[PDB]
Amino acid sequence: LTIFALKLNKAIRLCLTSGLSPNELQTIVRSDNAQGIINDSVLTKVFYTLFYSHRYALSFDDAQVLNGSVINQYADDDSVSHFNRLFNTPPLKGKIF
Amino acid sequence: LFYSHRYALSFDDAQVLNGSVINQYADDDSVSHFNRLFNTPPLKGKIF
Amino acid sequence: RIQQRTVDEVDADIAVLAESRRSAQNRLEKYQQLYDEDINHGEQRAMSL
Amino acid sequence: RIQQRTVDEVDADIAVLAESRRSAQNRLEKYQQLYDEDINHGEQRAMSL
Amino acid sequence: LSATASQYSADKISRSEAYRRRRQEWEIQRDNADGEVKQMDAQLESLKI
Amino acid sequence: YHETIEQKKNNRLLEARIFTRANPQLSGAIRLGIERDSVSRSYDEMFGARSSSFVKPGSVASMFSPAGYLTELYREAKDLHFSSSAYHLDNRRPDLADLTLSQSNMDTEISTLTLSNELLLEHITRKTGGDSDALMESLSTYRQAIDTPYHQPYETIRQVIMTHDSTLSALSRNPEVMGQAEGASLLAILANISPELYNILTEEITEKNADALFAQNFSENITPENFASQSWIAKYYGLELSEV
Amino acid sequence: YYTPMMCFQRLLQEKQFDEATQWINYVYNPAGYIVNGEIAPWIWNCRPLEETTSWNANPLDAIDPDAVAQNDPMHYKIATFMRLLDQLILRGDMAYRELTRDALNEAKMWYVRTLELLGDEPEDYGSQQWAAPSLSGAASQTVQAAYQQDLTMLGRGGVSKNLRTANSLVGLFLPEYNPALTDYWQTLRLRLFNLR
Amino acid sequence: ASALHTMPSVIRTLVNIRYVTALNKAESNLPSWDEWQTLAENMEAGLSTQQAQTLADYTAERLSSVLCNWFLANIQPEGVSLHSRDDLYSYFLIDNQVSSAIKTTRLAEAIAGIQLYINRALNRIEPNARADVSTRQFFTDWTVNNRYSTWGGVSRLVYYPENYIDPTQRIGQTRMMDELLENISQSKLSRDTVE
Amino acid sequence: SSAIKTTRLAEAIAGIQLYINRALNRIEPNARADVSTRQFFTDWTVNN
């Protein structure tokens, strides 16, 4: 259990010190890479998304898209995801693809 | 007293103005004038 | 002429407030008499008997 | 001159509000005591008898 | 007959206490009337200036 | 036990009586209605002028003032647990025994945080044996805690910079000086990452140094056996289970 | 004692003054008493109060100011006096409502009456001189034991020995002035400063 | 420099801190501990008074939280299973996460701590209670001695019964005098009525 | 303050009343207690 504990410690320390939500860190790390690991690039995305959030007054989604990442198809999924916020409220007439 | 009247200042301000020094020991049951100038609050440590 | 009419208006309002004052002081002094007399001799007799 | 007089007017108005403030405050205090006293010993004795 | 006399005494003191409460109400409402009187007296001087 | 309780009550009564007699407040034409007893003189000579000694209400020296109330409180409380056990008042708050009872001590006004902080400092420095500055320096590189490291000058800078202008918008209006400031410093002064916070966030995790990093990232008493429990993670970070 | 007190208190509660004073003069009168066309030699008009007799033994069994006062009658003494000057103050409030010049003089007369009868207020003495012990020393069991022992000896005995008690055992507390008396003193002083 | 109301040298220095911490960039310009302190000292020098109080407040709270955490994770005195913030609150008999907006005096704090200790003792929430001493006289009246005001009233009773003496009603009365009392309870008592 | 206005008669009333009151309460030493018992002084309550 050691390595997973180290990973979770890293992420939880970051989010608690940074006002970041678990899904937000999920999205930013996935957008950085499918590894789920952290490097300078992850913290780069973190900083710039929060900076643009502060200045232009947008949510975490808009900033994360702005930094160079993609629009996330699979958010928390207990609520409407970001992608379906963009193109699925409502569907035009049929289901999206 | 004249300066307190004109410039609308408390006593100690005029006291300093007249040529006397900043009083480092007032009533001492409250903050002295010196510690009113340099000790509200201390910056990070105790003054010297 | 217009300003003559406006000063007339404020004079009328003065009169309005004045009769307001008369009504208020009437209510006041009626209350004051009613309060000072407190309890008259009828209720005194009621309690005594 | 006219504007000096309008300042005079607002000063009169704030004084009026101050007097009405005192009146309402007196009503408040008298009601507060009248509430806190609640039931005096007269009614307690009525109940006891 | 002890009980009936006690009932009588109870209602008479209770009635007197009700009178006293009415007296308090009259007093406060007269005070409030006076407050309004002087307040609108001040309104008068504001209006005349 | 009876004889003792009536003894205390009688002593209280005699003190009260003798005190009421010599009250200078009662002069007063009613002074002409009070006398001087032999017991009055006896108390006079035994306790000197204490009988004539009174205080203004609201002073420390009063027996009804909070000072005497606390004196009685501690007098009673001093024995609720055996000296040996860890619940002894002298053990838990040794500095409470030597608290002076002065007018300044009950008049002055200081925040609860100040006293709490200095008491915690006193215990920590009692343990390690160092001073405040060494403690702060250790904190700047301490890793084994949910709040460590704690770079007080750094957070002060962050707080003041947020005070003057958040987002450094005016700073953005000076792009030439931005040829020298990169994103790293701006992140440091926008979010809460101390240098050691960066070091812990940007250190690779592999098994070759796994336990070593674990040792660096936790206290000895913490182990993955401890970590496995969800309630344990919630109480370790003070978070909610639904959140974890 | 109790019934004249009763009638006087009820009369004062009903804003009634003069027959109330006439009533309270039954038990006490600062102007003394007239019997047989002559000035009385006694001071208070209640014999038990003059003789200072107690009719309770163990008053601290319950929490009753009645018990304590009955165990030492002179408390009762000052109590009545207290209530007495009380109506004096209540006179002024009535005399002051009408804001009329003659009633103004009457109110000043009442206030000088209570001023003269009240005497001279004393002031703080012990606080400047009292030393400041540590809490532990203040709660020293030995000092409290010594004081209690001194008190018991004084009570059942009254021995003159230990002329000095070595005040260096500064661990006791001092009696505090009755707040009600200071309340009335400040009341009179504020109303007088107002009146001038 | 004027935007921050400060010197150009210190803004140079703040920008000079390449926050890359031993490579991934030029190099680590991380200031030493004392250099950090001096930079902070100078930087905050141009701050007003109410802002000074706000900074003192924020720093005091942060330091309090860090200290509490550190004491949890470091020193574990035997005899207590202190495992949270409120555990330290109870064992050190003083609150540790209150806002700084609250102010008090030493005596008030000591009063509160000792009260809470006594209360903890009585309810047997504390192990190894010396139950022999819990039966003392003072604790019997703990209902009326848990408060300073109530204690003051009951103490000031015996020495000054006059403040609390009420002629109007007392206990021990004879219903005969009570009947007098209710017979003199009318709205207005003229001479002959009281007679 | 001089804001108080009065007449010689009113002040004389006040002074003499205060003298009588001081005498009656035995605040003044050496009172001629024989004359203090006069009929006028019995009704001092309604003659004050």
Q: If you write DSSP's letter for every residue of F209-234 in order, what string do you get?
A: GHHHHHHHHS-TT--HHHHT-HHHHH
DSSP, collapsed to helix, strand or coil, labels residue F114 as helix
- Three-class secondary structure of residue C4 per DSSP: helix
Under 8 Å between Cβ of F21 and F34 = yes
In H105-164, the residues whose Cβ lies within 8 Å of chain B are none
Total residues belonging to chain D: 49
Show which subunits contact H, needing at least 3 CB pairs below 8 angstroms.
Answer: B, C, D, E, F, G
Q: Which two tokens stand for residue H181?
A: 């009392």
A52, burial (CB in 10 Å: exposed 0-12, middle 13-18, buried 19+): middle
**Which chain F positions have a beta carbon within 8 Å of A43's beta carbon?**
187, 193, 198, 201-202
Token pair of E5 as six digits: 């006399």
**Alpha-carbon span B20 to A48, nearest angstrom:** 56
**Residue A58 CB neighbours (<10 A):** 15
Please tell me if residue H57 touches chain B, with a CB cutoff of 8 Å: no
| Structure tokens given for D12 | 């009169």
Q: Which residue of F112, F153, F181 is in closest CB contact with H95? A: F112
Give E23's contacts in chain C (Cβ within 8 Å).
35, 38-39
Find out whether G24 and G4 touch, Cβ atoms under 8 Å.
yes
Exposed, middle or buried, F6 (CB in 10 Å: 0-12/13-18/19+)? Answer: middle
Rounded Cα distance, G195 and F235, in Å? 68
> What distance in Å separates residue I35's CA from the closest CA in chain G?
10
Q: Residue H141 to residues C16, F7, G68: CA-CA distances in angstroms?
A: 68, 19, 19
Distance CA H7, CA G88 (A): 73
Maximum alpha-carbon separation in chain A: 50
Chains D and A touch (3+ CB pairs under 8 A): no
The answer to whether residues H145 and H138 touch, using CB atoms and an 8 Å cutoff, is yes
Would you call F110 helix, strand, or coil by DSSP? strand
Q: What single letter denotes the amino acid at residue F166?
A: S
Kindly state whether H187 is in contact with chain C, defined as any CB-CB distance less than 8 angstroms.
yes
Closest by CA to H170, choosing from B8, F240, A25, G9, is G9
| Helix, strand or coil, per DSSP, at residue G56 | coil
Please give the Cα distance from G139 to G136 (Å, whole number): 5
The DSSP-derived string for D1-49 is: -HHHHHHHHHHHHHHHHHHHHHHHHHHHHHHHHHHHH-S-HHHHHHHH-
CA distances (Å), H145 to each of F4, F242, H132, in order? 21, 44, 19
Percent helix, strand and coil across chain E, each rounded to 5? 95, 0, 5
Query: What are the backbone angles phi and psi of residue C8, rounded to the nearest 5°?
Result: -60, -40
Coil, helix or strand at residue G34: strand
**Long-range pairs of A18-27 with CB within 8 A, sequence gap ≥ 24:** A18/A46, A18/A50, A18/F191, A18/F192, A18/F193, A19/A50, A19/F191, A20/A46, A21/A60, A22/F243, A23/A75, A23/A76, A24/A60, A24/A64, A27/A60, A27/A64, A27/A69, A27/A72, A27/A75
Method used to determine the 3D structure? cryo-EM
Q: How far apart are CA F239 and CA A8, in angstroms?
A: 13
Q: Which long-range contacts (CB under 8 A, 24 or more apart) does G93-96 make?
A: G94/G15, G94/G17
Question: Pseudo-torsion of CA A31, A34, A38, A40, nearest 10°?
Answer: -50
Left if phi > 0, otherwise alpha if psi is -120 to 50, otherwise beta: which for H22?
Answer: left
Which residues in chain E have their CB less than 8 angstroms from residue H185's CB?
Answer: 13, 16
Chains B and H touch (3+ CB pairs under 8 A): yes
CB contact under 8 A, D41 and H182: no
DSSP H26: S
Distance of alpha carbon A44 from alpha carbon H62, whole angstroms: 26
Q: How far is E10 from chain H (nearest CA, A)?
A: 9
> Using alpha carbons only, how large is chain G's radius of gyration in Å?
22
Which tokens in the block code for residue G91?
Answer: 């006179």
The whole-angstrom distance between H173's CA and the closest CA on chain E is 18
Which chains form contacts with chain A, at 3 or more CB pairs under 8 Å? F
Phi-psi map region of B46: left, alpha, beta (phi>0 left; psi -120 to 50 alpha) = beta
Determine, for residues D42 and H169 on separate chains, whether the beta-carbon distance falls below 8 Å. Answer: no
Give dist(CA A80, CA B3) in Å, integer: 71
Residues 6+ apart with CB under 8 A from F3: none
Residue F117's SS3 state is helix
- Tell me the two tokens of residue H101: 């907006």
CA-based R_g, chain D, Å = 22
What would the 3-class secondary structure string for G109-176 be? HHHHHHHHHHCCCCCCCHHHHCCCCEHHHHCCHHHHHHHHHHHHHHHHHCCCCCCCCCCCCCCCCECE
- Resolution, in Å, please? 3.9
Question: Is residue H103 classed as helix, strand or coil in its secondary structure?
Answer: strand
Other residues' Cβ atoms within 10 Å of the Cβ of residue H54: 16
Asked whether G113 and G88 are in contact (CB, 8 A), the reply is: yes
Which two structure tokens, joined as six digits, stand for I35?
A: 């004359």
Can chain C be said to touch chain I, i.e. do they have 3 or more Cβ pairs within 8 angstroms?
no
- Say yes or no for a CB contact (<8 Å) between B40 and H41: no
> Cα separation of F187 and G79, whole Å?
75
Of H106, H97, H103, the residue nearest H63 (C-alpha): H97
DSSP H127: T
I1 touches chain F (CB under 8 A): no
G74-97 helix and G101-118 helix, angle to the nearest 10 degrees:
160
First-to-last CA distance in chain G?
Answer: 39
CB contact under 8 A, I14 and G38: no
Distance CA G161, CA G164 (A): 8
Q: Which residues pair with G39 in a beta bridge?
A: G34
Give the three-class secondary structure for F55. strand
- Bridge partners (DSSP) of residue F55 are G176
- Candidates E2, E7, E12, E23, partner chain H, best to mutate (most H CBs within 10 A): E12
Task: Select the residue from G127, G148, G168 to test the F interface by mutation, using most F Cβ atoms within 10 A.
Answer: G127
The reply to whether I26 touches chain G by the CB within 8 Å rule is yes
